[PDB]
Subunit: 297 residues, 6 copies
Amino acid sequence: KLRVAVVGYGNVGRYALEAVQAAPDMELVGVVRRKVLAATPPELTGVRVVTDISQLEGVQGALLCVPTRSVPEYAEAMLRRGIHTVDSYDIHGDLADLRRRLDPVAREHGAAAVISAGWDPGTDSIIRALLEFMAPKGITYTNFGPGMSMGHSVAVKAIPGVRDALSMTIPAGMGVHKRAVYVELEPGADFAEVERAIKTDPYFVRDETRVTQVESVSALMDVGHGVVMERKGVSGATHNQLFRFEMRINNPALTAQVMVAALRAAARQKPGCYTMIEIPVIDYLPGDREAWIRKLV
Amino acid sequence: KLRVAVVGYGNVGRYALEAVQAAPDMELVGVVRRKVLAATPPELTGVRVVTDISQLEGVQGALLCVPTRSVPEYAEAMLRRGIHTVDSYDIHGDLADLRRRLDPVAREHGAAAVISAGWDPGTDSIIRALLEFMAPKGITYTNFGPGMSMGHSVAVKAIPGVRDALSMTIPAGMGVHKRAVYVELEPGADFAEVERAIKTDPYFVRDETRVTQVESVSALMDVGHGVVMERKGVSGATHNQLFRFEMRINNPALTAQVMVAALRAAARQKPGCYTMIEIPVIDYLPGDREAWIRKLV
Amino acid sequence: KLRVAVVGYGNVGRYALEAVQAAPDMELVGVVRRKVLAATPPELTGVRVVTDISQLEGVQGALLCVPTRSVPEYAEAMLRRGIHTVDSYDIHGDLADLRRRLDPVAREHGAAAVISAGWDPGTDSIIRALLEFMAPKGITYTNFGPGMSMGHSVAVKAIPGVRDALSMTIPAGMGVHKRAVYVELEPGADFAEVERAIKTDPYFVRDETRVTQVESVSALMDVGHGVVMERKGVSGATHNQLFRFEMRINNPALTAQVMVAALRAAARQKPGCYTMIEIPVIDYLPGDREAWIRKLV
Amino acid sequence: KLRVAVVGYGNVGRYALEAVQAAPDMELVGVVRRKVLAATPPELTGVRVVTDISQLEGVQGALLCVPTRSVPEYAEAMLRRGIHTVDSYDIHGDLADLRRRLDPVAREHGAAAVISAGWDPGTDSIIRALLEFMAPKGITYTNFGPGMSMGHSVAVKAIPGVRDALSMTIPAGMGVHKRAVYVELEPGADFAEVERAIKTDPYFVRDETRVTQVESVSALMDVGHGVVMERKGVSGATHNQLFRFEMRINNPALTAQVMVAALRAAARQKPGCYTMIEIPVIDYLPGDREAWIRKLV
Amino acid sequence: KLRVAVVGYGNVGRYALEAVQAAPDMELVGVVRRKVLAATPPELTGVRVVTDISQLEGVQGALLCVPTRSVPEYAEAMLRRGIHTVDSYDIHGDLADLRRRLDPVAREHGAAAVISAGWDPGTDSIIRALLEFMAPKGITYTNFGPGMSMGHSVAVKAIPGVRDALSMTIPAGMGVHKRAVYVELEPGADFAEVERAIKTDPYFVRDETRVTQVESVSALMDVGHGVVMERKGVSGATHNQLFRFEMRINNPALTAQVMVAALRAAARQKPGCYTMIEIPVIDYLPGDREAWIRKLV
Amino acid sequence: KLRVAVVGYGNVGRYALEAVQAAPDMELVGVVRRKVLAATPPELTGVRVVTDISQLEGVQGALLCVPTRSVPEYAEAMLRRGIHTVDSYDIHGDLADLRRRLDPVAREHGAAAVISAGWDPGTDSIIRALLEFMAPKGITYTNFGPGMSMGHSVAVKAIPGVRDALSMTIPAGMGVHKRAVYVELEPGADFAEVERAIKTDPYFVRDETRVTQVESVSALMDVGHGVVMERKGVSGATHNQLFRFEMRINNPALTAQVMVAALRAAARQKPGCYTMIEIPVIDYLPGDREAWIRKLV
Ligand SMILES: NC(=O)c1ccc[n+]([C@@H]2O[C@H](COP(=O)([O-])OP(=O)(O)OC[C@H]3O[C@@H](n4cnc5c(N)ncnc54)[C@H](OP(=O)(O)O)[C@@H]3O)[C@@H](O)[C@H]2O)c1
Ligand SMILES: NC(=O)c1ccc[n+]([C@@H]2O[C@H](COP(=O)([O-])OP(=O)(O)OC[C@H]3O[C@@H](n4cnc5c(N)ncnc54)[C@H](OP(=O)(O)O)[C@@H]3O)[C@@H](O)[C@H]2O)c1
Ligand SMILES: NC(=O)c1ccc[n+]([C@@H]2O[C@H](COP(=O)([O-])OP(=O)(O)OC[C@H]3O[C@@H](n4cnc5c(N)ncnc54)[C@H](OP(=O)(O)O)[C@@H]3O)[C@@H](O)[C@H]2O)c1
Ligand SMILES: NC(=O)c1ccc[n+]([C@@H]2O[C@H](COP(=O)([O-])OP(=O)(O)OC[C@H]3O[C@@H](n4cnc5c(N)ncnc54)[C@H](OP(=O)(O)O)[C@@H]3O)[C@@H](O)[C@H]2O)c1
Ligand SMILES: NC(=O)c1ccc[n+]([C@@H]2O[C@H](COP(=O)([O-])OP(=O)(O)OC[C@H]3O[C@@H](n4cnc5c(N)ncnc54)[C@H](OP(=O)(O)O)[C@@H]3O)[C@@H](O)[C@H]2O)c1
């Protein structure tokens, strides 16, 4: 049974606690937070919560449920302690570089790191790889939403006159996305100004963006999300092969569960850093291989 | 470039030829048939066709496009020659045992074998594994068709009074399948009896079966097929996670293309036998890993 | 404009009245009924209604909106008067013979008859013909409903213990249909007996049938109906060509409109009898061909 | 059997070869190409290939699988030799005029010509005509794709800084289409300039267009295509009649098969030129009419 | 049995007549029109038609099928006569104020008024309320069409050079709508200018608008319409609850039927004015409550 | 702010705790359980838990999250204490009688009771009522699943030789349902026996039932569920009006949230007992009516 720690008790972190507790081959040693207040969250009543992973006895693996930009530093800190790490780093543009950066650190400390192990990047990545070799010629389209965007939401809220905001990702089709922004204005903030400020912002200038002022943004929030991946391609020399994959899921819940499966896999790999398509899928399953082969193949 | 041979020029074999010719990292050395007639099929005009793989110079990998029951003997024959092998062996209840049987043969002759590498078993198996770890609790349903059934058609054609027949697999839902049989009666035969013999045959006795007599079975044949895989499960402790995968494809065309990708992967493994869920998905992709990670993850 | 008469003021007849009035190239001369009561239906207030088509001056075409079994004698009666005729005779197994029977009658009296011109048989027939030549090899499935069934309902009301009944046609998929019967029992009739008689009747004996006793059958009546026609076949030697046609329509409304278009075509044909697939489609369109070619091709 | 020749061995031509070989009522006499090299394509090994149709003995019909702008001269050349002709000329705005031009040429040489016989124009045209008379009032929407666009792709390759390109037709709904262009730039060409030139070109100027630079255009090519035709209209005076037709097919494969069926019909017509809606649908079916009436109506 | 009068014999009024005649608990006393010509519409032959509701003996309820702007004055006129009233007033931004305006008028004359009782506002409003309390946090999207737009069509028809026009409402998703305008130009008018005047008009300036010139607008008219309402929200603290409601209906037919049900409810309320969400749903059903509870709950 | 108690800390009870805590107009006073163990569930750490509702100060309303058969006694016990009550009693056959039984008890103690307030019975009941008056003639079909059935599951588990079981409700279409049973056998229990015992049981004899033996039933459980309600009917005299409502939700989560909304409504009613269709929908919404009318109608 793998001794694991949840690092970062945020949205994903809260679901990670549950995923670890539900895992048959793992034991939750504790949670690592930046601060630990006297008032204990109800669900953490019988859970060890500290600020230093060192105080969690025999930790073998860590789920890095921290902000994207904090992942690099956290992974290196855990790896240098010989602790296997998993994160759902979501920047497609440079996770490949993150992989090269963490590989030597992981190896030199006898640990394994699996990066970008959420649903996208993550499991969606595996699916895209499958579609790619099943029909080498053609185009795969990944359509996200409806669901909220963390990055886009923060960007809008950082605008003067904006008390709080919600940015919805809407699938327009063929891999194109539009934005539906909902904003809660400050004292005498002018909507027109805020509206153009949003549409102009580099985060929305590239896509069709619509803005709406609301009384309460919190009243509109839901972490449900989804994706539709499609490919029309050529298998060998045979055209029009049609594939479609769709999910309607709780975003953080799925991410945390995939992270758990990835940490299970990490503990079984040779020291180094890996993305999800570099690990045999059976390594994400608990227990002996034989039974899974008979049940799933 | 991997030198490959197509063994068995049947339905899948014909597509395998095309899949190999289209692969950027493979070279088709030739085709192995039980017999080679003087009348050369048009598309094989510039292709080396022989009855013994030994006559195909420098073959490194073999695509075993032979009947399911012939796979075991063919795989051992090729492996004992040090030739990597791929097959799409389709018996879910026995493939695990085939794996154990071929493992030492492959290993002792420095070769790798990837078995059951079609779409089901095969790629569908990978998808089922993903759904399984993304939402550990729940049920996955695999719905096949509409499409023609392998053995079912032969089973009916073996009935007295049946000139030729076609058995369609029809999805009834919840992983249950119906059978739509089309028969071309032999001069004199009685439909009523044939209809009874079919519905009572062990091959159909367990599923809803409907029989129809037709003037020509050939006029009804189409190798298109498909599948709908669904799962409603729990990620961690979060219920109602919804997943759906569907494809509408040319059956043998997809199978042959997956076999090609699997052979590419086999050549990159340690000697032994593997099912598709025991191989990192990136090994099914041609060339350098880096490029694929940046493109797909 | 073509002078037309509506024969039989029933369900389809009521809609035919409207279809003719809306046609830009036709003039409604009148309606022919078995009897004409003193109480005139509101919508027929300004319409000539008689018991003999001879009383309708200059009639050139007749829409035979009479029961299926009455069509043969009605068509011969009209044709022998030199009047073009259209009907939506719905017996697929007898259709061809009706064509042979009416052909010489129509020809010898210088008139044209278009039979079975509803949506099925009728327009669905044309679609089936199209799918057949677009992909010669494969299977076309015609799935009807949900919608009320003609004879099935009358057949149920035929049993003694039934005051009124409604038989719904339910698509089970792959061309198979289920029956949902609703019955209003006579005071004292046993439901169990009726339920048994229904499922036993040769009208439901070979189809999954379910019975439900209801307070009022009239409260469940709706003339909406539909169809889904699908085909997965081979174009040339290319497999898995996928086609799908679906309609959700008012049954008698569509039937009456198709009959109108067919009568327009009939007036354009050489004397004789025709099914809808024996007439160029442009003949079903009003006016000059040139305009339609530019608008539709 | 009708003796037929395939003129133009391009995309559609390659499929036409197969469609003719599979036709039960036709005999492939040969293929006519602009040039015949010493290296014979494998599939043409046992086929007569020449540069002048006169070298193909007893040819009665010709499938003109040449570029759109070449159809007029090719059709007149064949017709003046008394050879029936079929083409899938795709310009909706000129179609009618081509018909007028070829009609007297066909007639004076005792031959029949069926123009624009692909799926659109072609079979889609018949479907549009059906929907039009089934519900005279309303609007029919024809939504194409996803699939590759003919001229659009060549038009993009027309710009200087483009080595190769692919233009995808994307259905935006309600008969509106979007463009997804993929370009492979020449060493040194500026993407910004190309992107601008594309969106500016009169081919995309009036449609939402998006451009993406790609490593390889060939790796994105797939000949699959499709259409969704819908109409909500009035049958008689009854509103909201709903119709829907959809296809997911191999573009050239379907086009070639329709051309074959149209040539069969042409040989059955009085000398002159016809579009597909001017021919009874049963004429597109092989053999005796009686059998088809019983099987399809 | 409630004695009812239909006020305004327009689109909705014509259906209201039928809805009242079909209601088991209502008696149609007559129709109130602005003028009554000597030429009686066929369907009104046995119906009392007058210009003053006072001539309709014992009227207890009135269905106000008049233009939106006329509703206020008509409702106050009927209420001041002690006659219960129902209207489908469609202005979402002002109906709350209409409610406050009519409340004291209805109360002081012992009558009840139910306003905005169509499908939207109306039944859609009830559905939105249900979704709102079933999942308090999240967003509900109401997508209309395809279907003809009320004011939009009139707004275009008021443009110089426009003989007649039709404005189609097209759902773009996420509660956003597109406009497809069809215009029939007056002899001489310039399309380019009309097209500009339309797209710039306040009625379309906020949505994507496309204009098309046609020979006949009447040939494109169909009163079918529809809606798709969706919500992804949080029930309690559980995210991703998914809801979807859709209908494809005859617009005025449904509106008139809902108005009838609302009038039935009005007659059962304490004097005052009500929107549809202020009435228990069982009050919209005819007769005794007990029977409905057993049949529907 | 309404002071509320959750009675019964089971599946629904656990979600009810969350729904009350999330409600803006309610205050959770505590939870009433049959027993209170020393080991406190983490999430109940800061919550008052007792065995007698009397120990919860100032309780005004109670959510009866107890077994169906316990509802009658619990409701009467709470009502006799002057506490408003809500339950999701799910027996369609006699909830009408429960209503008559609780009405006088509620009234005589100055309290209000809203029974059967889940999604079915409950919100689905409201939807069925709407469809009923929008189109009075026709048939509404309620299709449940996929999702688990509590009753059916218990019935199977009570069978000798059955360690544990799971009964899935599968929609077969048109209001017909099939059962997919999963069983975990005891020591030497014979499957064949258990299988027929299930198929024979009155709980499954009425429907198509399939049985499967599994290693672990708990590994297959998920509380997700759903429904598809459809109606094709007549509005007035206009046929083929089409309606569809679908939900994919967490079963207990939705039920608890609806119960909260119903308790809010109960507190606003005259003393007595009500089903959900007897309460204006706006009463299920928190706060003043004005704002909801403007936001939703
Ligand atoms: N790949 C995917 O498919 C996918 C999908 C969804 C999310 N994700 C990843 O999941 C990450 C976390 O998501 P989330 O919604 O859980 O974020 P979150 O709610 O903000 O949680 C992050 C937690 O880390 C700690 N933290 C906060 N700010 C920090 C900082 N500035 N420096 C160091 N630690 C900080 C806090 O926990 P304590 O208070 O306990 O310290 C905080 O609650 C996302 O950023 C994204 O990268 C990936
Ligand atoms: N896993 C999947 O998803 C999946 C899907 C589809 C198919 N498959 C597998 O693919 C296998 C082959 O399918 P297929 O349609 O290509 O079969 P096929 O058409 O019968 O071709 C098999 C070929 O094997 C060669 N052969 C060698 N020994 C033979 C023998 N004893 N009897 C007959 N042929 C023999 C023949 O080619 P020569 O004449 O050249 O010797 C024959 O044409 C299937 O049996 C199945 O196991 C798997
Ligand atoms: N092909 C299709 O797609 C399709 C679809 C729907 C219907 N149809 C055909 O069209 C027929 C239409 O029937 P319907 O729905 O309009 O209702 P119906 O009850 O068949 O009405 C037929 C009318 O024919 C007249 N009539 C003459 N002889 C009659 C007789 N012997 N018995 C009863 N009526 C007689 C009556 O009008 P008067 O009182 O004015 O004499 C009667 O109302 C269907 O039965 C079927 O044959 C075809
Ligand atoms: N809430 C919804 O979901 C919804 C949906 C659809 C429609 N509606 C409502 O239904 C209303 C009526 O729709 P409609 O299509 O029936 O309108 P319409 O066709 O124009 O009919 C309105 C009738 O009102 C009478 N009338 C009285 N004063 C009039 C006036 N000042 N100008 C013109 N007519 C006047 C006329 O009948 P006489 O000639 O007999 O006097 C006229 O035919 C719409 O305006 C809208 O408010 C609501
Ligand atoms: N209408 C709908 O749409 C709908 C849908 C779903 C469920 N429901 C209703 O919700 C009800 C409860 O569902 P559930 O899944 O929460 O059931 P459950 O998990 O068994 O919870 C019932 C709770 O009541 C107490 N209890 C158990 N047995 C009892 C008994 N024999 N006598 C008195 N109290 C008992 C227990 O709480 P303590 O241990 O705290 O005492 C138990 O946890 C269902 O029975 C059904 O009627 C309705």
